[PDB]
Amino acid sequence: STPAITLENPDIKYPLRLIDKEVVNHDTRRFRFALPSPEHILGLPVGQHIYLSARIDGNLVIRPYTPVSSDDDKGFVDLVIKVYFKDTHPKFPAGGKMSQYLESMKIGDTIEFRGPNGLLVYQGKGKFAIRPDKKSSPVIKTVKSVGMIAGGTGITPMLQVIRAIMKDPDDHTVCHLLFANQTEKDILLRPELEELRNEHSARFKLWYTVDRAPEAWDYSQGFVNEEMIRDHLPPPEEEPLVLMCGPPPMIQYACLPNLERVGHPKERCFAF
């Protein structure tokens, strides 16, 4: 049989109860929410995400999240969240709306989930189904490798795909991740990524860049650039799929221009 799914209809909101909050580090949390029963699964295809919605200080706020759990997990969904506190970053004095609201929640409070959403679904063994828009059928494309460029919170769409590939021992797709962050301290999910590298180095290539580097730093410094794409993503000759998720200026200035300079078809580079 198959487990009951939570996300039965994408236009329904499902209020899920907060059951655990882990303080990962000063500004990182893992939130665990109960599904409708211990035997349910979320029902989130690999490649897709959920939305959280809430009334935050009187206004509707909707944001996308990719869980760090999977449909293998029965009874709960886990979200890893970077909390953007007010009065930290000079360009963002108010901090982040949904992430601070999540940080405010008490155990037992609910928040609305919806999904699945997104134009890309991973069908396994290198095959991706990518719709040009929601109203259109997917282009099925099968690749031997996947370049991945994540910035900041944009890691979780990548991690979800990486994990789905690595857990299939007969999936020979090679993932190459280039992961950008403000600082070393701000990197999400480093232990998790490094466990995957330890176990799956033949299929999983990992590299970091940071806007500013610590004194002891083994990786790159600066924004994603042409050299980093040449050195840390599959070459365009191999026709990889290129996936991206990060802040709009990162995609616009750092990623697309440099993917083009290396020769990847810019129009085929997919942004989550």
Ligand X SMILES: Cc1cc2nc3c(=O)[nH]c(=O)nc-3n(C[C@H](O)[C@H](O)[C@H](O)COP(=O)(O)OP(=O)(O)OC[C@H]3O[C@@H](n4cnc5c(N)ncnc54)[C@H](O)[C@@H]3O)c2cc1C
What amino acid positions are annotated as catalytic residues?
Answer: 49, 65-66, 245
Establish whether 97 is an annotated binding residue.
yes
Residue 82 marked ligand-binding: yes
Could you tell me which residues come within 8 angstroms of residue 212 by beta carbon, excluding any fewer than 6 positions away?
182, 183, 221
- Specify the residue for token string 């970077």: 82
Residue with tokens 């301290």: 185
Nearest to ligand X of 157, 240 (CB atom): 157
CB of 176 to ligand X, least distance (A): 19
b/e burial code for range 149-184 (CB count within 10 A of at least 16 → b): bbbbbbbbbbbbbbbbbbeeeebebbbbbbbbbeee
Q: What share of the chain is helix, strand, coil (3-state, %, to 5)?
A: 25, 35, 40
Residues that bind ligand X in the complex, under the rule CB under 6 A: 49, 63-66, 79-82, 84-85, 88-89, 92, 95-99, 153, 156-157, 245, 247, 272
**Is residue 101 annotated as involved in ligand binding?**
no
- The reply, when asked if residue 141 is annotated as ligand binding, is no
Q: Which lies closer to ligand X via its Cβ, residue 38 or residue 58?
A: 58
Q: Find the shortest distance in angstroms from Cβ 144 to ligand X.
A: 24
Structural contact between residues 229 and 259, judged by C-beta atoms closer than 8 angstroms: yes
Give the Cα-Cα-Cα angle 128, 14, 189 (nearest 5 degrees).
55
- Closest-by-Cβ residue to ligand X is 96
Would the annotation count 250 as a binding residue? Answer: no
The CB-of-155 to ligand X minimum distance in angstroms stands at 8
Q: Which is nearer to ligand X, 43 or 64 (CB)?
A: 64
Residue 156 vs 173, nearer CB to ligand X: 156
- Helix, strand, or coil here: 154? helix
Which residues participate in the annotated binding site?
A: 63-65, 80, 82, 84, 97-99, 156
Which residues participate in the annotated binding site for FAD?
A: 63-65, 80, 82, 84, 97-99, 156
